[PDB]
Amino acid sequence: DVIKGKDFEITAKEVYDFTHAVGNNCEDFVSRPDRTMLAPMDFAIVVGWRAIIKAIFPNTVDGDLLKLVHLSNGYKMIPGAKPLQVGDVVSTTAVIESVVNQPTGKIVDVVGTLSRNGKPVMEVTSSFFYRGNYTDFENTFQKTVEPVYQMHIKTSKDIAVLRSKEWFQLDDEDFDLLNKTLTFETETEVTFKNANIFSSVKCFGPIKVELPTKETVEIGIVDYEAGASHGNPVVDFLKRNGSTLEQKVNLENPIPIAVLDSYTPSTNEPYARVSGDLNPIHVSRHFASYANLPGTITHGMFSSASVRALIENWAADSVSSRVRGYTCQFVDMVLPNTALKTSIQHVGMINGRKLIKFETRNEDDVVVLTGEAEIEQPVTTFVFTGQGSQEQGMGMDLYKTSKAAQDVWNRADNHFKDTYGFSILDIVINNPVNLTIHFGGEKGKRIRENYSAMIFETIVDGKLKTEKIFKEINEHSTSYTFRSEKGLLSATQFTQPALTLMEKAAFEDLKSKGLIPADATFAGHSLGEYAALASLADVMSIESLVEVVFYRGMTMQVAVPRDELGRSNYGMIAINPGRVAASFSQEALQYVVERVGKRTGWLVEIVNYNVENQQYVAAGDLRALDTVTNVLNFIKLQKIDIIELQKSLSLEEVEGHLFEIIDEASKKSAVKPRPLKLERGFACIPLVGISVPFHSTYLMNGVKPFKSFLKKNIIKENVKVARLAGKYIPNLTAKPFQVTKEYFQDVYDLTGSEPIKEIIDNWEKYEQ
């Protein structure tokens, strides 16, 4: 039966006392004003003690409590809950896990459950050892709570195996188990007969299947019940055939973090006071000598806390929140005034949580303390790079080594061959100059039809036009050829997928090595945006991803008429506001650029708001770009401080003057050779090979084909809300991804979408 302790008020007093007892000097437990005081996870034992220690007391568990040995104590913060604040009221709930008779004595396992406002907060796991010889097999049992096991059903044999198992009781017998994901929430009662042979094995718990809608439903019961058995059949089945939710992944080489000297105090009195562990063998010498001990020993739970404080210091960088799960094995006992030598090792990861393993020795170089510590990564944001930076064989060093990388590239490459009839690898590795796609054979035909169906929409003097890309390609075409001057790798329908692949590949390696936090936020610059979504929320398959990115590159290439050769009348330039003048700011470029495009009539706009007063990018008309670089060349050579005579001297005579300054650079750059070579000057640097004003208003037209293509390659049942909500930051709406009215509204205010507005008009689809 369950033990409940008194609800415990945490006070600023009791934490302050406990920290100085154990010697934890972390900032989080000090009364700085505004930023409330935290309580350590060590402090749970002070709360837990009254309930936990009660478990070993009953008549049916009969032991010489003088010869009790504290074996192991483990903390485990449940996922999501915050650690103990100073103001918290904590309910304790102690369940005994295992009473077991071994030859050397009886082991008692206790599981505390701290409760804040009715929510579970952390599990306190203690193991206790009565020395002696006990034939107490009647009052001996094992009620454990087994962790959750998940099975991916792939084959027609996986289903047939489960149907052979008596304990696989479904609600619906006919239910389709193909391509589904079962999750098994399992506990198990065991009673004993001997030290080896169990008298009654009982294993039960619900069977939930992962639905496409992110939440699971229970449609299955485990119902195993046996007599004289040897082992738990159900669990051993789930070990081999299924897997845990969380996979531990060891590093190639363990890292010594630090080797530290924590010392035991001269007396055990001050810990006994705050803890409630008044055990006489720690304090009174005559009691100690009766238990055959080498004198008054230092508390087990003191040593645990003391080492944990250094783990907290040297792995969590003086932060209490990051440490998630701490266990502590007690090998041998510890005298006062002893010099403990604890070595700390970072050994592994588990889905973005560091595995710390420590080992504490005394002067005599004898093992005293071992244990494990699950510690969080710091608060993490993944940001994915955009266009520009692309070399021959980028990330191919990573392709050779990482299994996860090999998966990404090849599966994409297999699709490029089977749908668009080229090797994206060949492109990256070799960077050829001419590539010829051939449409011969049944397989060739399907690739040609895939080139045909590509469309875009440009405004041609009157109205919209559903003109297709690749005018040459018809039902009678055999070859199409890609032509560049340097190499295909820098022609942006190749740049873009390669860049996207490299980043995704890199990510999946980190995911395989478990270096990714669950609560990571993510965004991406122009292109990286797409990779980010495929990376952290599995929005598209690798298959469906590179399709879009390829199509993006294609629609970007044609949206501008470039009649002459590979030369349009559009481009873009990067600006450094700092270089021209020390006062020239954002609000200075927003005037100049808006005025040059209102005056000349030529379209020029800011497209990249990258770094404040250091890196902006303006795209548009090459005539209008030669003006802006010359106007910015003018304000850098005059150096006539703008804040001095902006509104302070000449009120809106800037507009008259800026025009006069425009119309001697505007009427000078309009008489140039038609596809004008752009040069660099003092602030404005041209982006080489960039010919398209992407992120401008000019290409608002060619969206309907791009949208309709996204609709084919982004299916509804591939979008996890939870793995996007307040983690994903788009480029359009630089606010956390939320599914709320004010978000939908903020989009349409920039967008003008009819599918968005028809949702705002009846936001009352709260009722299914």
Next chain:
Amino acid sequence: PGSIDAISQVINIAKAHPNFPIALQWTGGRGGGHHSFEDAHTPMLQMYSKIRRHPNIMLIFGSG
């Protein structure tokens, strides 16, 4: 002397012959002709203490 290190050398000469008078003609960078990179004040403030330990040193200032 031009530098801190040169004052030291003069001192060591005064230690060698404690009975012989030595005119310590100090010159900063501010003086005319072949001049050092040293402020007039800074090195004297440093070295005055150890200079006046030896009586035979007659301390003379120049440069400007």
Next chain:
Amino acid sequence: KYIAKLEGASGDLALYKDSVRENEIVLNNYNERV
């Protein structure tokens, strides 16, 4: 060494540069004297 260490990475680099530039002027006198 203090050039090659900082060149791997611009204040407190020109002050190393004219220090080794100055030593070459004094060294040019030495081997001329030799």
Next chain:
Amino acid sequence: TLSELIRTTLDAEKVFTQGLNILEWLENPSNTPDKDYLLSIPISCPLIGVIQLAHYVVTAKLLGFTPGELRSYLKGATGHSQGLVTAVAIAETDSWESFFVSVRKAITVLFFIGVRCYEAYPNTSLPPSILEDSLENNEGVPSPMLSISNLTQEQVQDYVNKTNSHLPAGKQVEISLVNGAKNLVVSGPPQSLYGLNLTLRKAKAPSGLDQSRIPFSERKLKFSNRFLPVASPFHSHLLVPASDLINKDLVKNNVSFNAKDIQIPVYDTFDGSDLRVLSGSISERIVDCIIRLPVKWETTTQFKATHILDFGPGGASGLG
């Protein structure tokens, strides 16, 4: 008398974990506590006073003088930070029997200063990335007191206003000790003092430079910036809540200093004035001279004399 003051004071035994049986700590070195906890301020402050009083004893005894005779040959006396209390206690002594009643006050003062300032601002664990960086940048173990050699008071005051401009009220740093003309000590949060040390490493020369062929006004400054091995910011606004609680804990422990009992001038550490010429309580001034008010040592060592006796701790590292 300190073992007494543990039980006499409300919450002392939990601050004084490892006791204060200093008899056994010296007579048997194996029972001695750690070198990390002795340096903590509630146990450090009074024991350093004890050492200063001890040096006064071993002086007086080998002369054959009573302490009343030794103080009489003194023209004056003063003390650096916490030595000031032990200075006034030396002014009060008359005989070997009426010595131990001054020893009882130098302790009360140091004891409660140690305890109540630990309550007001205790030192916290530092991020090891900041710690490791300061060790290889050769600055000391990060601590609430930061020593700046070889800079003018003016030069330091420029480099704190740069740091204090980016700080809110309760974390600003201030010049705390003015030891020499070019020897300063700044106090504040160790976190903030690291941020000050960032600014300093900019304007400092690498030590193996030989600046001998650079004009003087373009030379980089060659100075030493490093933390002090202390556990509390003395003479800081951080400890002002401690000030009120210490005066209150002198009253209940029957301890005050009177102008007529002290028979030599003891020099104020901020004014350089005589403490004998106050209207108010002397003890209340001595607190503020340690806790809040800075230490202009130059204007403190203003007296003309022939000989000065550094009983202070350190010896060659001593104040003298």
Next chain:
Amino acid sequence: MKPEVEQELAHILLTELLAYQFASPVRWIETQDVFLKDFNTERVVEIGPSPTLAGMAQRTLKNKYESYDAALSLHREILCYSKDAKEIYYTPDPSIADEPVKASLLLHVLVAHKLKKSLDSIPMSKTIKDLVGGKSTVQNEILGDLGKEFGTTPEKPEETPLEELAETFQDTFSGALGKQSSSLLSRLISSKMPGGFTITVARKYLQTRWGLPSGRQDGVLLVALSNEPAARLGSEADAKAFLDSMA
């Protein structure tokens, strides 16, 4: 809201979000100013072949997050994938003729012995006030030793590196040990366990077995002073193997 519909909305929402990302500006200001401020990100990881966004994040914090980061005591970690692989993957790297004794060797030994440290843990390109913990009594105790050892010292010798300070003594110094080093070697043989054989009998063993005259003899003894054993070793036979490793 029912998760079936919640799904439907998100799916639609994200669809137009990407469609219209394409044709509306990148508001990377408010992107930066959300995860830096509204989430207090302790670690940004740029996944990409070049550190473009690292730079953009790095210089945004330089501009307007000076006052904010310090106000929360918030340590920030800026990482790119390509450059800072090792911090992200958590895989750092391990990391015979007679000659009078050099002043460079003798200087190193006198410093190493006073600091209770090994003959390689002291690098020569380091000032005396640097490799001392600022103790100062240790500082001037070393300067007190160098005053006894070499005689005349430069001005502020504790501000010039031991490498630079070695050549200054090397000029006016020649071979002869002197006051301080002899007294330390006087302790080394006496206090430790050449139990029977004194200075003279220890000198003759180096000269007979290895073949080292007077100048080479002193240099081997100085290395033995830096590698002082301090454990009560038994006989001559162990003490012969001590002088073998030091040679």
